[PDB]
């Protein structure tokens with residue numbers, strides 16, 4: 001993570017109203033096993 | 041810190057009062073997100 | 085402003101219910117059963133907020 005300062009502008013607000021306890025990310029696998037790029 | 045390269049680590053991370061997410065990436069490997077409590081069809 | 089629509093069997097006691105009715109295992113939802121013969125307090129009312 002680089003040094004410096006940056007402010008996050010607001011993007012979205014949704015009235016979903018559901019209870020939230022856990023979350024998980026989503027990856028875009030490419031079939032050319034499988035070969036995928038590098039990310040952090 | 042999680043690394044994806046095989047390296048396939050997509051665990052169910054806990055949620056709290058808020059979440060800060062950062063991604064150092066090129067060519068758009070990461071796409072979206074899933075939120076919930078039981079992660080199944082029973083709950084919203 | 086929280087909406088809950090879970091149909092899981094309520095565990096009144098400590099013995100597990102396993103999704104079926106039993107001792108200390110009651111369904112969380114009951115029916116009002118509105119009838120004209122009922123009292124004014126028991127009469128149905130429509131509420132809009």
Ligand SMILES: *[C@@H]1O[C@H](CO)[C@@H](O)[C@H](O)[C@H]1NC(C)=O
Nearest residue numbers: 019020021076077078083086
């Ligand atoms: C939200 O869901 C979690 C997981 O089922 C539960 O432990 C928690 O009590 C729920 N929140 C409320 C306010 O009931």
